[PDB]
Structure 1
């Protein structure tokens, strides 16, 4: 098998995700012990706006 084959290295993603038919990725995490979830959601939306 070494008389007609070569070899090299590459970089590849071992896990591909899709959401609603488009490539996507997911971040999962909680909020602070002393604040509401909705405020964290709004701040995450503002951060994603950037």
Structure 2
């Protein structure tokens, strides 16, 4: 559970010669095409 709601932690990283910033943007894009009632958030290192 994350911030009181059911969640599933997904780790990962950007490919070589790619920024963390631009890797995260893609994850966000993909995450908007997911089924209804499903959101996301950034935690740990991605939050800061």
**TM-score of the aligned structures, taking structure 2 as reference length:** 0.64
Greater strand content: 1
* Cα distance, 1:33 vs structure 2: 1.1
Structure 1 gap segments, 5+ residues each: 1-17
Larger relative contact order (Cα-Cα within 8 Å, sequence gap ≥ 6): 2
**Higher Cα radius of gyration:** 1
Moved over 2 A (4+): none
RMSD (CA atoms): 0.6
| Consecutive unaligned residues in structure 2, runs of 5 or more | 34-48
